[PDB]
Structures are given as C-alpha cells and as structure tokens.
Write a structure and sequence with these properties.
Order of helices and strands of chain A: HEEHH
Strand content of chain A: 5-15%
Shape of chain A: elongated
Distance between the termini of chain A: 59 Å
Number of helices of chain A: 3
Oligomer: part of a larger assembly
Largest sheet of chain A: 2 strands, antiparallel
Structural class of chain A: mainly alpha
Helix content of chain A: over 70%
Chain lengths: 97, 49
C-alpha cells in the first residue's frame, strides 16, 4: 500500500511540473524572443528519467506499465527536440549578427 | 504438415528451416502469454502487434 502509493505522487510530480513548466523568453534586440536556462531543464529531464528507471526495477511497476512508459516517450522526445533546439538557437544567434 | 511428414525435410529443405524459426518465435511468444494470462499484460508486451 505504501509501496505503490509513491507511484502516484511521483508520477503526478512529473505531471504537475510539465503542465506548469514555462519556457523562459527574452527579447533579442527587438527582433524575436530567445530561450535561456538550459542547465536546469536538462537536469530536470534527466532526473525524472533516473527516477523512472528506479520505478522500472520496482516490483509494483506492473500496475503502471502504460503511463510510466508513456512519460518515457514524452521525456525522450523532449530531450531530442531540445538537444537540436539549443544548437539551432545558438547557430542562428551568431549567424544573424 | 512439417513435423508430421518426414519426406518434406528431404524434398523442401530451405523453407522447412524457415518454419522452425517462425515456430520458435511463435512458441516463445506463446510462452510469454502462458505465464501472463492477463489480457492487458499480453497487450502490454513490447511490439506484440
């Protein structure tokens, strides 16, 4: 009972961080807005990945196969989307100049 | 038709070999279902479809 209860509040912790997560935008010379603060986000995404991997070895993971695996698809796609985003943003910053 | 008939091995060698590979994949998949008769757990098998 207390073994599996942690599966909810952790999973909804992932639920509540992302729906409340905000992309910080700074105006770039009155042309557009840009995203900063990459270190905390990358730490945030990876620690959720590390947290879920601990759920993978948990014996009570069977009753939450679908939802936890669903977050892995979203979390990994977030990593893939933003790994190229940070580079693409950086290149455009010093190419427009 | 494959296991029962012994002449098919001599007369149809290569695709007989293809059958056991399919048979092993099918038998292994069935064994996965065998230990977990639950519909959802079978439905939750990675790449079962």
């Amino acid at each position: 009972a207390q073994g599996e209860m942690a599966l909810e509040e952790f999973l909804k912790q992932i639920r509540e961080v992302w729906n409340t997560y905000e992309l910080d935008l700074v105006n770039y010379q009155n042309k557009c807005r840009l995203i900063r603060g990459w270190d905390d986000l990358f730490n945030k995404v990876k620690e959720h990945i590390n947290s879920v991997s601990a759920m993978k070895l948990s014996p009570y993971y069977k009753v939450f196969e679908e939802d936890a695996l669903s977050w892995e698809d979203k979390l990994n796609r977030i990593m893939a989307l933003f790994d190229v985003w940070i580079d693409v943003q950086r290149r455009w910053v010093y190419l427009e100049g | 038709i494959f296991t029962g008939s012994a002449d098919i091995k001599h007369l149809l060698p290569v695709e007989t070999q293809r059958f056991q590979s399919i048979s092993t994949e099918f038998l292994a998949l069935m064994k996965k279902v065998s230990k977990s008769p639950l519909v959802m757990d079978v439905l939750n098998i990675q790449g079962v479809q």
